[PDB]
Design a binder for this molecule. Structure first.
Ligand SMILES: C/C=C(/C)C(=O)O[C@H]1C(C)=C2[C@H]([C@@H]1OC(=O)CCCCCCC)[C@@](C)(OC(C)=O)C[C@H](OC(=O)CCC)[C@@]1(O)[C@H]2OC(=O)[C@@]1(C)O
Ligand code: BEF
Ligand SMILES: [Mg+2]
Length: 994
């Protein structure tokens, strides 16, 4: 029965035809279960194990590389008894790699935690219903609850389903809805209908929502909806329907792949249009029986030379280590890619309650009377540190620690806080944290008492569990609590009647301890306490008290204030009627004012500094909360989102004010405003969406169910470690530590990571360009192969893979966080740099092919072959007379390829050093600025000597150790590449913007 909030209690009962006194009959339950299904959410099970392996082989470059292995297999098979000793070696490695990185992705993606299967850490286990079955309440599985069921809830209970309140048993019902609406103060409920069918959750004051918990009181109700029809149900589906795009970097890697794909085939067809001349020469060396093997011999060499086979490995290792470093900051990264995207964050949307704040009411100020003398009245004001329920913090006066117990006024204040209290504090040994028991605004008094420790009780040698009630327990032994006059909405105060306990003070008599909204309690005080004595309440005294209450109630403080008082001579229990709260106020009169306490849902300690760091990093911070605007703005002022006295006319909107704006203005408002209050879950998602429409990488920070949709839509969702299960499953990162400043450390980490990544991506892709130039050149010139796939794969994965990882450790710039976020559309390579890699690529191709040719034509120990008898080496056998002389197999010698590979390697070591800085000269930024890069080159080089000496290797790699005369040539060929780039950079700084 949606809309139950607008209907009366009788209407809701009639609607389901159920008796409020007995509950549904076992027949109606069976039928309602049938018509409404169980009270649970569907299992979110997607992508199994084999489903991941599939998508692993869907990458455009992988299929090309794979189809390249298939073609390599046919070749290894058609490999005659000339080199059939290690022919199938090529197809193997090509497939081995594809399987290596593959199983890696599966092992990587499999690591995950479900959203609905984990959401059961929020969906109550049990529920309490009355059913015709029996007279007593029944405790059943919450999943077995159906619409129409009569449910009972009491303090501490987790509401099992969306319920229409029928009857309130206690004097009032207070509900903590922070996990769902973001409200920071428990909500007083009622049973009357809420007319406006469009009333938002914060307005449904006659409804109880599944997932929330009872702060105080007891009530009976009728289930309105269950399963996916509940408020928490609507949000989950909302979360499930939101789509997420690929990371900007991943979109660039995909674009690269699509473009590279076009270039490959394009060159494949290009060479083809250079072999068409074969249909001119009069010679038949194999129609369609043997002669055709050479085309596909270069086609696979091209696809292998163009594709950075080692990139997937370098990137994963980089991101993985990045995730390790974050974990040391207690930041659990759920998605490896976001480790970097986080660096591109331009706007950080953040929930308020439980995210920007602790969501734990804290008393931070209090005062008692100091002295009264005529029109003069001075107060003893104190401040209290600590922003959670933990009994950890101090009491200060004029910013200095004092012993509360030395102020008799404070002893009575603590006493009232401890006794006039129906709640307590506890230590969850499981979660390892202190938790409230009952009402937050009461537990705040409990922890205040533990901090004050007015009797200096010994607490150093206590366990977390004992420390939670040590000082309160001591005070509870001083007086016997006879009864309590529960809080009432008209009176706005609560009191307890106490009789003397310990025989230590029997000449005291009965007392009444009162607390409540200041105005009404103070109006009912005829006396004011000063230390231990009492003076009459006079205009001047009342004035000073109210003026300080006023200050604390607004401005820089904006605290919730509570006045504390006691009735020195309370009525005899006999002359008091305790069954009607309408008489309580009168019993709470002729009181003696004792003091005031100011409390609030405090901002977490590191938020203010964090927001200032973001500002300098060009990152906006926007508050998006379900709480009322007054509290939203107040917190914004405390953390610096707004100036202490700034006017927020058009920089703070409520959900309604926002909706009253035409779409265009709404969109613009997201760029100007920083505080959105009284908003719904879809409002948060909407705001994120507007930000994203301006091409801004947005992050969202939350803790509750109402943050789940937005957390998912944001490029980077950040959930509080102490938040809900939903919010965490919807996030890429979790602050296990609840430290908001870790977000800034993550951004910094993400910026450094990305800058290094750009350098190694550039490095690797750069070498592929040169490699393709080498292949194309030889295929075009008709010359023999200078480099072969097996050699290219080893260099692309090891020789260059190691230095690429080292670049990942390049020291970050000192002003990394003193600059705006880079653009998400910023291309990794373009403009001048495109030309640089263009020139380097050409330089590598010519140098590698040239080195090979050199050995073939000038090497003092190679054949003195002529240029075109080398470009026509293919016609050696058949036409020996033309270009005769020597063995036709020398054209397949390992010396020339080794000469070419050694040049590729040496050149890449140099370009690795050119990759330390985009435009800085190696003289300005020395090679030793990254010790790792220097070592990686040593490792890569010694691995080269390995592949050239350990017999097995040089055999399968088609190589052979070169001579010192040949190496020196390799150096003279390679080294100059440093001079080339050392020049292109110079041209970029002086005559360009670099
Ligand atoms: C990997 C090796 C090679 C040789 C390759 O073909 O790379 C090209 C290519 C796909 C791009 C190019 C290469 O293009 C050329 O050199 C010109 C076209 C050649 C056609 C020849 C027809 C007979 C990069 C490599 O060239 C230079 C010289 O820097 C730069 C850059 O790459 C990046 O920004 C890398 C992205 C991670 C990309 O233009 C990129 O395409 C894109 O969409 C980008 C934005 O990506
Ligand atoms: F809890 Be959030 F402030 F909506
Ligand atoms: Mg919240």
């Amino acid at each position: 029965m949606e809309a139950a909030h607008s209907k009366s209690t009788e209407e809701c009962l009639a609607y389901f035809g159920v008796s409020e006194t007995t509950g549904l009959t076992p027949d109606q339950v069976k039928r309602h279960l049938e018509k409404y299904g169980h009270n649970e959410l569907p299992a979110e099970e997607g992508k199994s194990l084999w489903e991941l392996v599939i998508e692993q082989f869907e990458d455009l470059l992988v299929r090309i590389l794979l189809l390249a292995a298939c073609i390599s297999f046919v070749l290894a098979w058609f490999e005659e008894g000339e080199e059939t000793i290690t022919a199938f070696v090529e197809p193997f490695v090509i497939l081995l790699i594809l399987i290596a990185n593959a199983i890696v992705g599966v092992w990587q993606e499999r690591n995950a935690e479900n959203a609905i299967e984990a959401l059961k850490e929020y969906e109550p286990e049990m529920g309490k219903v009355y059913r015709a079955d029996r007279k007593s309440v029944q405790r059943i599985k919450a999943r077995d609850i159906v619409p129409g069921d009569i449910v009972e809830v009491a303090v501490g209970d987790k509401v099992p389903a969306d319920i229409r309140i029928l009857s309130i048993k206690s004097t009032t019902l207070r509900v903590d809805q922070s996990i769902l609406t973001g409200e920071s103060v428990s909500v007083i409920k009622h049973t009357e209908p809420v007319p406006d069918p469009r009333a938002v959750n914060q307005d449904k004051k006659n409804m109880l929502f599944s997932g929330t918990n009872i702060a105080a009181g007891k009530a009976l109700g009728i289930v309105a909806t269950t399963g996916v029809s509940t408020e928490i149900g609507k949000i989950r589906d909302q979360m499930a329907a939101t789509e997420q795009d690929k990371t900007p970097l991943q979109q660039k890697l995909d674009e690269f792949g699509e473009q590279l794909s076009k270039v490959i085939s394009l060159i494949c067809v290009a060479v083809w249009l250079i072999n068409i001349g074969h249909f001119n020469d009069p010679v038949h060396g194999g129609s369609w029986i043997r002669g055709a093997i050479y085309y596909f011999k270069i086609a696979v060499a091209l696809a292998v030379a163009a594709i950075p086979e080692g990139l997937p490995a370098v990137i994963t290792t980089c991101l993985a280590l990045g995730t390790r470093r974050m974990a040391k900051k207690n930041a659990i990264v759920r998605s490896l890619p976001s480790v970097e995207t986080l660096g591109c964050t331009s706007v950080i949307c953040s929930d308020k309650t439980g995210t920007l704040t602790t969501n734990q009411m804290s008393v931070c100020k209090m005062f008692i009377i100091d002295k009264v003398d005529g029109d003069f009245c001075s107060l003893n004001e104190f401040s209290i540190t600590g922003s959670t329920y933990a009994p950890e913090g101090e009491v200060l006066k004029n910013d200095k620690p004092i012993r509360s117990g030395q102020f008799d006024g404070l002893v009575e204040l603590a006493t009232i806080c401890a006794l006039c209290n129906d709640s307590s504090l506890d230590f969850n040994e499981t979660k390892g944290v202190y938790e409230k028991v009952g009402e937050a605004t009461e537990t705040a008094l409990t922890t205040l008492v533990e901090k004050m420790n007015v009797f200096n009780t010994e607490v150093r040698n206590l366990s977390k569990v004992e420390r939670a009630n040590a000082c309160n327990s001591v005070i509870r032994q001083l007086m016997k609590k006879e009864f309590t006059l529960e809080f009432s909405r008209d009176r706005k105060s609560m009191s307890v009647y106490c009789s003397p306990a310990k025989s230590s003070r029997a000449a005291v008599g009965n007392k009444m301890f009162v607390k409540g909204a200041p105005e009404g309690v103070i109006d009912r005080c005829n006396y004011v306490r000063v230390g231990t004595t009492r003076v009459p309440m006079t205009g001047p005294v009342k004035e000073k008290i109210l003026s300080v209450i006023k200050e604390w109630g607004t401005g820089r403080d904006t605290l919730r204030c509570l006045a504390l008082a006691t009735r020195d001579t309370p009525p005899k229990r006999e002359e008091m009627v305790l069954d009607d709260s309408s008489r309580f106020m009168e019993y709470e009169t002729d009181l003696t004012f004792v003091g005031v306490v100011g409390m609030l849902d405090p901002p977490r300690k590191e938020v203010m500094g964090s927001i200032q760091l973001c500002r300098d990093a060009g990152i906006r911070v926007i508050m998006i909360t379900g709480d009322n605007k007054g509290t939203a703005i107040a917190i914004c002022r405390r953390i610096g989102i707004f100036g202490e006295n700034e006017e927020v006319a058009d920089r703070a909107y409520t959900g309604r004010e926002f909706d009253d704006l035409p779409l265009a203005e709404q969109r613009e408002a997201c760029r100007r405003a920083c505080c959105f209050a009284r908003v719904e879950p879809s409002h948060k998602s909407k705001i994120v969406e507007y930000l994203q429409s301006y091409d801004e990488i947005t992050a969202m920070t939350g803790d509750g169910v109402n943050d789940a949709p937005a957390l998912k839509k944001a490029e980077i969702g950040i959930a509080m470690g102490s938040g809900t299960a939903v919010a965490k499953t919807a996030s890429e990162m979790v602050l296990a530590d609840d430290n908001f400043s870790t977000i800034v450390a993550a951004v910094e980490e993400g910026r450094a990571i990305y800058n290094n990544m750009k350098q190694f991506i550039r490095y690797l892709i750069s070498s592929n360009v040169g490699e393709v130039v080498c292949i194309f050149l030889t295929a075009a010139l008709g010359l023999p192969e200078a480099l072969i796939p097996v050699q290219l794969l080893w260099v692309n994965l090891v020789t260059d893979g190691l230095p690429a990882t080292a670049l990942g450790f390049n020291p970050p710039d000192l002003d990394i966080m003193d600059r705006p976020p880079r653009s998400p559309k910023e291309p990794l390579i373009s403009g001048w740099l495109f030309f640089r890699y263009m020139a380097i690529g050409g330089y590598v191709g010519a140098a590698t092919v040239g080195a090979a040719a050199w050995w073939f034509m000038y090497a003092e120990d190679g054949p003195g072959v002529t240029y075109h008898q080398l470009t026509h080496f293919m016609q050696c056998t058949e036409d020996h007379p033309h270009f005769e002389g020597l063995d036709c197999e020398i054209f397949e010698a390992p010396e020339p390829m080794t000469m070419a590979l050694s040049v590729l390697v040496t050149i890449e070591m140099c370009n690795a050093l050119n990759s330390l800085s985009e435009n800085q000269s190696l003289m300005r930024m020395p090679p030793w600025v990254n010790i790792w890069l220097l070592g990686s080159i040593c490792l890569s080089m010694s691995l080269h000597f390995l592949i050239l000496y350990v017999d097995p290797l040089p055999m399968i790699f088609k190589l052979k150790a070169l001579d010192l005369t040949q190496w020196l040539m390799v150096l003279k060929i390679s080294l100059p590449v440093i001079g080339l780039d050392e020049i292109l950079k110079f041209i970029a700084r002086n005559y360009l913007e670099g």
